[model samples]
Target chain A: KDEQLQQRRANQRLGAEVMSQRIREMSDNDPRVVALVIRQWMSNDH
Target chain B: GTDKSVILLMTIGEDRAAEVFKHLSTREVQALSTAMANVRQISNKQLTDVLSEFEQEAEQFAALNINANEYLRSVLVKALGEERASSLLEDILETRDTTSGIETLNFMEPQSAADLIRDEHPQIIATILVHLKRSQAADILALFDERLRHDVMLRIATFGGVQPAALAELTEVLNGLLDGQNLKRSKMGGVRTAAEIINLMKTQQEEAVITAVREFDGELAQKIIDEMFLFENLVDVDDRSIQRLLQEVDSESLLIALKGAEPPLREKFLRNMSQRAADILRDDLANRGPVRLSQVENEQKAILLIVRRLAETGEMVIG
Candidate 1:
């Protein structure tokens, strides 16, 4: 089963969930920030 | 994770995410852009928690002011934890100057990676996987059907060198996935890449793939086999070499690498250490939490590079 690998996968899933939830909540406060940050980060390249 | 990193960036606000993005590559920038585009929600409490977590982890790890590299790295580790984050960070750091849509697969989960190109011909799959980190390619390869796995490994083993024309096919494969950009040229694929990818596979899978390669072209199989030095081979290393290798490697690296080792191999390491150090390492191993195999292999792979250097200089004997 590769015990450690499985544990890592579970932890990753949990981490992604928490991160996503945090982003959603932050967006709720100021949707403008999402566009603002994404634009700024994307500004130089891509 | 794009989602995780994207979330952190959003929480920290535009100034930080934009600043952090400065050090990133086109592929990373693209993925995070897409991830940010897809992010649905945000808040004061959530923002503070994420900020607090990033601050704490960053201080714990970096104690940074911090610069863009430190901030991005800290935020990533905060989102993904050390093991997972570090693996991505390695590729991220290495590929920063050049860009490739192909590199994005390294950032995706294996299943996500597999599902993207699984429907393609074996040649196409082989073509794409070769451009990825061998360890990442191995993970995605394991998800393929048995016959497909065998065919793809052989293709990778005997694969042709990539040309600009090849980029056309790869770009078609990547299609909407990410930018196929200048591709940041490098030599990739052939026997060594196949051997490395196979070396990272499980014991059962390794044998099956190797056997299939053998039937198609015996000498080619031998060439690939000749290059592989799996972690399990340490069981055969002499105590002197083990002790020599131990002296040069970090305890943190050895500890994580050993988590993925079989008992006999792990015991062999302990056998080489002083009794007190062995006991302490044993306790550390017992207390160590679950780790990703890629992370385990990253440390194992790092240790092996040292072993290879030792062997190169006649300092150690390796099987």
Candidate 2:
């Protein structure tokens, strides 16, 4: 169950760690690259 | 080798009320466990203090849905015969409910009912009256000694027994406890019939009828809408149960009540009806024209009168 899974302290901590790593990977080294990708994606999707 | 009265004392509280509850027999512990487990809403300090001495016990309890007392009782019951467990359960009732155990009585299965009736003191059950709503309390008192009823009522009034926040807290705690244990205590079980339901309510509680009508099940609700025109509705009940219900009721409510019908209900109600009944009603429903307030009131009033008359004259329960 999602409830039981969420209650696992290890899983909860790991989920937060994974999200933080993803955020770092998405934003590091080139900030403008992130901005350009967002604008391009929005234009293409719209 | 315990005596009969001593076993009963274990269920409520004998000299053991403040002592370590884990030492009690299985029947005694299980009877008290649920009540204690329901105290999660009490402040963390209070909860922590209660279980501080039994740290290992607390950790095990937090891992499982059941509580220490209930756990102890279950262990005892398994070790002993059913008869011993029953007596212990009976003894516990002596300290619990405090009102003829009416709330518990309403939901008990045969075994528990026997345990409640056979061994517990009626005064202990009567004490539960203080915790119930005025109407529920009155219903319980109706089963008790008349002299005791007045004295109990007086004590309740003197103590200001009905604390709204405390009641709300208990309700929330009890609901959470039930949910945690995956059980429904009583009210969730549902009543047998609309008439049985009506008989149980205080006047304000009859709004549940309006609620039932408004939130009627999609299929059955639609059936009611279909029957509206044919119903004689001659049963004798308060006129307000009809008027207040319809006034609170609206088109969306009608739509919900009419859900799952083959034909759109508005069309069915408006289409084949005599030009006389539909003359003004159809106009209110039709997009082509604006509606009048007096027309809406008059139509609703007419529908209520018709429904009431059906209730009065015919065999109309839930269906």
Candidate 3:
């Protein structure tokens, strides 16, 4: 179960990594989502 | 009368008892017997109701996988008897919907979305994207392999204005982050009825909440919410529980979160305060408290009603 959980976590992070890259690409294209992401990301940290 | 015959017809299907019923004449239909006695229908409505019930069970049988259908039929047949099962089947048929890809993925918990797609072929992801709105599709596509990016983009382009499956996967992935906690908590126990969670969203977040509500029954949301914890004014606490949770928190924005107490709860904070100090804090909180997501996510359907009312009164605006 523990190993399964670890594997699941790893698989889950792949999507997050993909999402981050997409957001970064959108930074140059769709500025609205980009702006929202930036605002959310910054707020997430601060 | 033909109580057993009706039960067999409804649950097992007419074919199962066709020979028996075929042997019986119209006289027999009027003279079937059970534990109590003879049975006779008083109206066409009763006959229609019985037929409708049989049709429902037939549909449910059609929807279930073979083993499941057999098992379901056996259980119902035994417990309800065939005639009653037929009637119940009608209700069951009325309740079921044709599950769609969008509905399935959108209903997934955020923590599970990435993993679910990771296990599927990239092209499958592409297919889903093709069906969604571009913005949401783009969100899902972003969760794919960078190496697969060109192919996925090609699929999206091939679809030409339609969202591809790849995009749906990406949107599914992205929505995970924004709504992960709610998804997680819904899985736990925090939510009650699907209707209850539908009610939980505040006036401002009604659209998103309604969308969530449509995707899953309340049980799913409750499963997620059950695992989550919200500490009121934990920001003001000593740096222990506060410190551990900081990674998931924004420290600088203490706005309305600081005002997150019920009148009685907030009174605890005011008890030790000097008159002027109490007034200052109280006034500030009432004037400008941070909207708590927990509160917004936990309310009943009335929140949407309240929100619509606000919009009617020009007191609020929602996208």
Model 1 over residues A1-46: C-alpha lDDT tens digits? Answer: 7998898777766865685676566545444434444444445334
| Alpha carbon lDDT at B22, candidate 2 | 38
TM-scores for candidates 1 onward, in order:
0.30, 0.25, 0.27
- Ranked candidates (lDDT, high to low): 1, 3, 2
Indicate the docking level reached by candidate 3: incorrect
The candidate that wins on TM-score is: 1
Which candidate, 1 or 2, has the higher DockQ? 1
Model 1 lDDT tens row, B272-292: 889999999999999999988
Name the candidate that leads on DockQ. Answer: 1
The DockQ-based CAPRI class assigned to model 2 is: incorrect
Candidate 1 falls in which docking quality class? incorrect
Worst 10 residues of 1 chain B by lDDT: B57-66
RMSD of 1: 20.2
lDDT of 3 by residue, B1-319 (tens): 1343343233323332343344344344333223114342332244335434433443333233224445766777789666556655644653543234454454444335546666656566576656544665555557656776677778756754435675566556655644433332223223433434544567467556644854867755444433221333322433333223323332222224445446654565344446886687677766774565675344322222333344456544322
Alpha carbon lDDT of each predicted model: 0.72, 0.42, 0.45
Deviation of model 3 at B42, angstroms: 42
lDDT of 3 by residue, A2-34 (tens): 999898777656744563454344323332322
